């Protein structure tokens, strides 16, 4: 569980989205596991606009923040689940670090702000859905 609150937008994992999220839908992409819905209250998360490859992510399964090195956003294959069939997820960044079911939604941050959210994991690895290319989140 977890979301990004920037201006009048809420950013969540698409597979974790609520009824409210779908009834107030702005944009969604299954191939990125992202969904953006509208909000009445104003959010103050700063989204990073950079090509950083080091940052810090929140791991709810350990109740701890962890520093990580992470790869450039790319098309990576992701095994089947009760939410999606086997497929390549786009805009995904990998890091060596702990994650287990229940960790999706944890924020990855760099010195410039929010980079993305936990979206995949397993085998001593963690995957993040990048949000830095979504320039419209700020306007
Ligand atoms: N983006 C997807 O299609 C996800 C959907 C949920 C499930 N997805 C996973 O990665 C599986 C899983 C979840 C987690 C996460 F929550 F950190 F992701 C950690 C580990 C694992 C593991 F190791 F058991 F396979 C794909
Ligand atoms: Zn940065």
Curated annotation (Swiss-Prot):
Residues binding Zn(2+) 1, per UniProt: 50, 52, 110, 112
Record's catalysed reaction(s): Selective cleavage of Tyr-|-Gly bond in the picornavirus polyprotein
Active site annotation, chain numbering: 15, 33, 104
Domain of life assignment: Viruses
General function of this protein: Cysteine protease that cleaves viral polyprotein and specific host proteins. It is responsible for the autocatalytic cleavage between the P1 and P2 regions, which is the first cleavage occurring in the polyprotein. Also cleaves the host translation initiation factor EIF4G1, in order to shut down the capped cellular mRNA translation. Inhibits the host nucleus-cytoplasm protein and RNA trafficking by cleaving host members of the nuclear pores. Counteracts stress granule formation probably by antagonizing its assembly or promoting its dissassembly.
Subunit structure: Homodimer.
Entry protein name: Protease 2A
Organism expressing this protein natively: Coxsackievirus A16 (strain G-10)
Residue window of the full protein shown: 869 to 1007 of 2193
């Amino acid at each position: 569980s977890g979301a990004i609150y920037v201006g009048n937008y809420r950013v969540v994992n698409r597979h974790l989205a609520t009824h409210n999220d779908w009834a107030n839908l702005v944009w969604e992409d299954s191939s990125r596991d992202l969904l953006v819905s509208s909000t009445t209250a104003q959010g103050c998360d700063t989204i990073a606009r950079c090509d950083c490859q080091t940052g810090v992510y929140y791991c709810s399964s350990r109740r701890k923040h962890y520093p990580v090195s992470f790869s450039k956003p790319s098309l990576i294959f992701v095994e089947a689940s009760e939410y999606y069939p086997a497929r390549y997820q786009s805009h995904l960044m990998l890091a060596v670090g702990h994650s287990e079911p229940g960790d999706c939604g944890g924020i990855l941050r760099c010195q410039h702000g929010v980079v993305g959210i936990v979206s995949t994991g397993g085998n001593g690895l963690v995957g993040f859905a990048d949000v830095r290319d979504l320039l419209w989140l700020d306007e």
